[PDB]
């Protein structure tokens, strides 16, 4: 399903993650925030994984 | 402007958002009074405080 995007003006966040597997050919560091349903992982540049 | 500029500096001090306005009692150590007086005047924005 699609990302509920966050109506609720809170949504917890951690930051300084690196991923794995790479989202491109090395890790990516980025923070987390936990949605309504989910969790949106974003690189420094803007990579959006759910 | 002698009270707004010691609570900026201890906010810089701590390092730390405004989380609350009880943070304006408990950390900032600010009268009562003072306190019933610019309690209802500062806004905490919770949208963008984001993590605590």
Redesign the interface.
Known sequence: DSLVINLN??????KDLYIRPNIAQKRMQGSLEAHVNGFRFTSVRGDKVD | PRKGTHLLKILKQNNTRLESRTQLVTMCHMGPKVFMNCAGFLKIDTASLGDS
Request: hydrophobic share 15%.
């Open positions: 003006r809170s949504n917890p966040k951690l």
